Design a binder for this molecule. Sequence first.
Ligand SMILES: CCCCCCCCCCCCO[C@@H]1O[C@H](CO)[C@@H](O[C@H]2O[C@H](CO)[C@@H](O)[C@H](O)[C@H]2O)[C@H](O)[C@H]1O
Ligand SMILES: CCCCCCCCCCCCO[C@@H]1O[C@H](CO)[C@@H](O[C@H]2O[C@H](CO)[C@@H](O)[C@H](O)[C@H]2O)[C@H](O)[C@H]1O
Ligand SMILES: CCCCCCCCCCCCO[C@@H]1O[C@H](CO)[C@@H](O[C@H]2O[C@H](CO)[C@@H](O)[C@H](O)[C@H]2O)[C@H](O)[C@H]1O
Ligand SMILES: CCCCCCCCCCCCO[C@@H]1O[C@H](CO)[C@@H](O[C@H]2O[C@H](CO)[C@@H](O)[C@H](O)[C@H]2O)[C@H](O)[C@H]1O
Ligand SMILES: CCCCCCCCCCCCO[C@@H]1O[C@H](CO)[C@@H](O[C@H]2O[C@H](CO)[C@@H](O)[C@H](O)[C@H]2O)[C@H](O)[C@H]1O
Ligand SMILES: CCCCCCCCCCCCO[C@@H]1O[C@H](CO)[C@@H](O[C@H]2O[C@H](CO)[C@@H](O)[C@H](O)[C@H]2O)[C@H](O)[C@H]1O
Lengths: 55, 55, 62, 39, 171, 98, 51, 459, 63, 126, 60, 170
Amino acid sequence: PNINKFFKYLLLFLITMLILVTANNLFQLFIGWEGVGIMSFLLIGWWYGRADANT
Amino acid sequence: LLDLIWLEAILPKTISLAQMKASTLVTNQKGLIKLYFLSFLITILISMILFNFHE
Amino acid sequence: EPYPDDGTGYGDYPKLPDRSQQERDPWYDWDHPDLRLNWGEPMHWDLDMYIRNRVDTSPTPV
Amino acid sequence: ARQWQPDVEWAEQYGGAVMYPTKETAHWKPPPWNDVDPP
Amino acid sequence: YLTHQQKVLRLYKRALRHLESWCIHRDKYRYFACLLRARFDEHKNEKDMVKATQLLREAEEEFWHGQHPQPYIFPESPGGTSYERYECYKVPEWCLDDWHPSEKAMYPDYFAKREQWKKLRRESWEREVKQLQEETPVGGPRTEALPPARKQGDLPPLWWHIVTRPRERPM
Amino acid sequence: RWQEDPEPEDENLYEKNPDSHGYDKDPAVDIWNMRVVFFFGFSIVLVLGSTFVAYLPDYRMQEWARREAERLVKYREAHGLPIMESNCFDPSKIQLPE
Amino acid sequence: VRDHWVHVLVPMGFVFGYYLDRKNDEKLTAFRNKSLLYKRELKPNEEVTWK
Amino acid sequence: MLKYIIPTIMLMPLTWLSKNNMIWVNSTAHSLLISFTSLLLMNQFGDNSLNFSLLFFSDSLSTPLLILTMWLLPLMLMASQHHLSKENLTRKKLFITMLISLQLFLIMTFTAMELILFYILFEATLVPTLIIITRWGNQTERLNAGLYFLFYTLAGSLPLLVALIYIQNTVGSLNFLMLQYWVQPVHNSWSNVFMWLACMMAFMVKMPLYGLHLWLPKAHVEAPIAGSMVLAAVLLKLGGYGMLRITLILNPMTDFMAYPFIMLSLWGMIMTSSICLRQTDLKSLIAYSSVSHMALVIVAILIQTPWSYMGATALMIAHGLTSSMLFCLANSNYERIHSRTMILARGLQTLLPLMATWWLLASLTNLALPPTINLIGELFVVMSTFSWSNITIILMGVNMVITALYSLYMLIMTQRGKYTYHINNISPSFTRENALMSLHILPLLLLTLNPKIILGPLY
Amino acid sequence: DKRFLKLLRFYILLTGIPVAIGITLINVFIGEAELAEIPEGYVPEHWEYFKHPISRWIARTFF
Amino acid sequence: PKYEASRLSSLPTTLDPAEYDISSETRKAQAERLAIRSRLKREYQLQYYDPSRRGVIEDPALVRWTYARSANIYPNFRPNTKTSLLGALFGIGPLVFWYYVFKTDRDRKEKLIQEGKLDRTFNISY
Amino acid sequence: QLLYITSFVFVGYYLLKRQDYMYAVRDHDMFSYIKSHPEDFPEKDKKTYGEVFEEFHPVR
Amino acid sequence: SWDKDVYPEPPRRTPAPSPQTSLPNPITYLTKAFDLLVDRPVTLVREFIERQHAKNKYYYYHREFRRVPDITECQEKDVLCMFEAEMQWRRDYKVDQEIVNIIQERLKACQQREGESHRQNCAKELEQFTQVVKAYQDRYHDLGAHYSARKCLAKQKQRMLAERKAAKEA
Ligand SMILES: CCCCCCCCCCCCO[C@@H]1O[C@H](CO)[C@@H](O[C@H]2O[C@H](CO)[C@@H](O)[C@H](O)[C@H]2O)[C@H](O)[C@H]1O
Ligand SMILES: CCCCCCCCCCCCO[C@@H]1O[C@H](CO)[C@@H](O[C@H]2O[C@H](CO)[C@@H](O)[C@H](O)[C@H]2O)[C@H](O)[C@H]1O
Ligand SMILES: CCCCCCCCCCCCO[C@@H]1O[C@H](CO)[C@@H](O[C@H]2O[C@H](CO)[C@@H](O)[C@H](O)[C@H]2O)[C@H](O)[C@H]1O
Ligand SMILES: CCCCCCCCCCCCO[C@@H]1O[C@H](CO)[C@@H](O[C@H]2O[C@H](CO)[C@@H](O)[C@H](O)[C@H]2O)[C@H](O)[C@H]1O
Ligand SMILES: CCCCCCCCCCCCO[C@@H]1O[C@H](CO)[C@@H](O[C@H]2O[C@H](CO)[C@@H](O)[C@H](O)[C@H]2O)[C@H](O)[C@H]1O
Ligand SMILES: CCCCCCCCCCCCO[C@@H]1O[C@H](CO)[C@@H](O[C@H]2O[C@H](CO)[C@@H](O)[C@H](O)[C@H]2O)[C@H](O)[C@H]1O
């Protein structure tokens, strides 16, 4: 039912990685570095009613 | 151990206890003219013999 | 059975088995299925440490 | 829940002869409401 | 709280599932599922309960030694890969009462029928409570079992949250 | 025990006003409260405030300092001077102790 | 308007406070056009450099 | 500053002469207008501060604190008007009057030129704040929270009064511009050690420093939502603002007097972060989160470097919006379930989708996701403490891990999992609540586009 | 939730669109100032030390 | 090889020696345990299923838990040998440990700077 | 209400007059005493910061 | 647009196309398409905008600060002189920060431009960066957050005292 939000999150995942890969300074790199990490949190826990997914 | 017990105990709880005990000492008086005027005699005597307020 | 009467502040709160909520029967019709708790039953002192997202005490094959 | 306000049990804390009861002031009683003691 | 028979049958089912996890192949599992059934059959008629309890006690120790460290779990069973997966889509029915009138207007027929279910629930509640009162011992209920409706036209007490519960695949 | 009023039941604003914005029971006051919050909060402070911040006249001289640094680097390099000196103050104006 | 006159209270307060803030500047003119950094000769039509 | 003081005062007749049903509309509309004009304080110069008169001045430190203060008043009014609905008219107007008076004291506090004037307004804030907590809090414990709040503050503040009066006798002035030029070094003696403590302890208690923080979790759990917002957002920063100014006249003694307080803060931030992992009250968790964040600010102020002072300023502003937003988020749940227990209502994302988004954004700012100004502030303090001593990275890095765990534990517990079956009064988020959350997060994130305006004088 | 987001969008654009249009027209038909040396014997006003027209207006009007 | 239980790996029920010694006394105890659970289940269900109830079914068990985890601790605290040692070791000990770690590190760094032996060639941000 | 304002203003004016007079007297007495005893209030010899030695305390 | 002396760039040496294939170069055609579809329309829009700017020519100026006596010439506690010397020092501090920033930008541009030969080919820029960072460190490092001209002068006098002492004994 939330397929639109899924594709938004996948795209945000992609954008943060491109920020990581093209960053020329360590602060810009850290933006992508933590960006991908937080996007993983939201997608690993996609089915948030399941305790194992949240864990 | 620290927040709910010892940090409470070592400052606010101990300070409050001392004040409460001091209050009871001060205010637990018999209301007797004889006793109050007797303490006046001790005060005047100590004021001279011990502290030399008369000099 | 209460916690031992040292000066630690447990009072009369019951000492229950130190088991994770993961160890409870998942087929029973719990009032709180996610926690596997029933309404009105005494909660473990460390319930928040024993939710299914945290410390598991389940038996292990080894 | 509506805001807690003092009940009778809370109020009686301030209706005694002293704020801090002790062994010495156990026999103290609040004075007459109109300050008059019976003859 | 489980009888001896219940314990023995639960061990049999659990041991067959771990056995199937080891064997994998259906023909191989059929072979050892029959050998395992023979062992349970060899002592089926044991009468001295002390002896039978010792057999069950030892069988559980043998099961623990030989269990699969990663047995097959049905996907939707507790601990399975799809367990609780659809809980985030299960919305309680009472949420519909808070819908804006323009949202309800989109399903006139669904909400007319819903209004009849709420009428049924309201008209039935007092009889449900009364039946539970007069069928419960003085001390209180000693088990969690609930009774059926006795009179015709009555509903089984405490039915609403079982009947109107979310569907297993609500979307 | 005493004579005290019962705790009142919690009141759902949507019950009487399904369009409630949650500001007031009165629907007309409710709408006006929403409008001022939104117009002054978002249209004015956030939008115009963000614009005002965006166009601040050289906040704290950062842009002037860059132009001035460029002028000094140009001059000092052309005349063969050091770009920067270790001494902030002219030693001829200082008397040391002892 | 007897129904909307309270809406002038805060805006008028800002105008008044603005006016009083400017009035304070007039008591702090001791060094107007006299600092070593900004002191300059006056323009033909100028009476003061700032107010 | 009269262009802000006077209109703030006018909010009082405005509230009292309003029609009965327009007190919230009028006070909210005009406090937002005052906030708009506060942006005129951004006229800052690279060298000189903005010196209005003999009483008031504004520089790059006090300006962002002023704009935060004037922004919060309308937000507080919006947050309060629901739980005050059944209150009678006169007692509502009194509540709004206390909020206005707090804003009046605060803007004068952050712009006072003279340290004794700062002290008096610094201390005047206790009265409205104490009244708000003890009169309009819901629980019995508010009376004790008021007392702890009152006497923790005065225990440190009265010694500060003696020290300040002593300084004026010795130096001849407490004017901050004068002190910038007439400051003399502080020599080692037991007299100066206690002068140092009297000058700093009042501010340490307000931050609060670890060990003197017990009043804070009491005050929040008992205060009404508006009391919690100003307490977390602004009143804690009185202590940080106080030290940032007074440390000017305590050098070089701060070189070693800082050690006990850096240790308490460096260890305290880990202790209070760990505490958040086991809190059962949602308001108490957010309160303990403030203690951990302000521990960084204390360390930043005490080590006195350009990078640490910039990080301290950004942190104070960022925490103001984040923490106040979190209290507002927790309060919105409280208005439905009437309990602060975190584990009571779960899976709320299923029932309140948009509100769960505010929860996610507040959590991500709380754990300092880059490039939020929360991260900018924390990172600048991390950079400067590493130069102070490389080993601090171990403590600072560990605290970053713990902060993520409790920030997301709070998110997961209340928003995710399965909803509580018997809680059937979770009505949809009101427009008022959604607007309240956006007026926190939107300016917070917009500041990422232009961080320099919240980096303070050392920028 | 949908009503709130529609209202939030409306009120941000209510002034956001006029501002975006206004800036564009100022940038096109007024343009920035050009840097120039101070003519001999000339005293610029304090707002003439800034380039963008909106910045000059801000400095002249408020600062 | 017998099962060795630990704090974080409980003894499986099937291997519990007492899970098979179900005497008339134990069966009586189990019945009493089920009686309490059924009594509480009925009290909850009569509110949970009540069509006219809108709100939260307050659970005294949950209220007792949050109260026990905060308000009830100090009233039942006694300063004795145990609580004093834990208080001293855990509260004061780490502060002293970190003071010496940082004081020692900073004293060393300061000595190196004062002798020009610490390399700060490009260090101009602090 | 009018008399409340008038009474306060009327008394306040005379109190403010006495207040300013007392402070004028304090200054008058102080300056006359500084003149009477020039030996106790000499003009300090002022040195520029180029000549005055101040220890430097690095923050590192 | 910018001063080339302040921001130097070596002369650019581009090789000429020297193909050794019969296949067409996809970049060449894409280059031509880009100039036709993107560059030409963009240039026309800009040329129109430049026409409007040419109609309304006005000027802004770089503020010039006269020099005032610095902290060394200020009498102790004379706030009126210390204030002007302190403000001048603060302005110079901001300027020196930007001088270092210009040198760092030169160094970073050289490193990218010189590619794999940057180590040998950016020696001059690395030297200038090294010297300016040393001078800036001498002036401003270790002053603390509450820095001032007075503290900066105290730092310099300590350095001059050490340099005198070493010179004398040597
Ligand atoms: C570190 C510098 C600041 C230190 C300030 C310390 C001074 C005291 C501050 C708090 C004073 C509050 O005043 C009083 O305090 C005590 C506990 O302390 C409270 O009393 C509380 O603890 C006592 C003992 O555990 C209980 O009997 C009581 O039921 C409980 O309410 C009183 O209800 C409160 O009226
Ligand atoms: C740094 C210096 C700061 C100095 C600040 C001075 C603050 C003084 C605060 C008031 C002191 C007396 O405050 C009083 O404290 C005692 C105990 O602490 C409280 O007494 C309560 O706790 C005690 C301790 O268990 C019980 O014995 C008592 O039955 C109970 O009522 C009183 O309810 C409170 O009124
Ligand atoms: C010589 C010095 C004297 C100085 C006096 C200066 C002020 C004189 C004010 C006189 C008018 C007072 O007005 C009197 O009080 C209030 C406030 O308006 C009015 O009634 C009020 O009701 C509510 C508040 O309760 C509001 O809508 C509004 O404040 C007003 O309508 C009364 O209906 C009016 O009779
Ligand atoms: C972030 C937005 C904040 C919104 C604030 C809303 C309140 C706005 C208050 C406006 C105050 C304007 O105040 C008045 O402006 C006019 C411009 O016409 C100025 O007019 C003057 O400006 C400068 C002064 O050096 C000179 O060019 C010249 O003397 C004259 O033009 C006045 O010096 C000022 O007194
Ligand atoms: C949270 C709690 C924080 C507690 C912080 C405690 C900090 C302790 C600082 C110790 C330094 C105090 O200041 C120090 O005192 C000693 C006296 O003992 C002074 O000693 C002074 O008198 C002695 C006489 O005995 C002389 O020999 C000496 O020449 C002279 O300096 C020093 O001038 C000063 O260096
Ligand atoms: C998006 C809406 C934002 C609203 C806030 C901004 C409103 C006003 C912004 C633009 C003001 C007009 O722009 C203003 O006019 C002229 C340029 O034409 C400039 O003034 C300059 O040019 C004009 C000639 O045109 C001459 O008088 C003279 O050479 C010089 O004063 C101002 O320095 C500039 O600031």
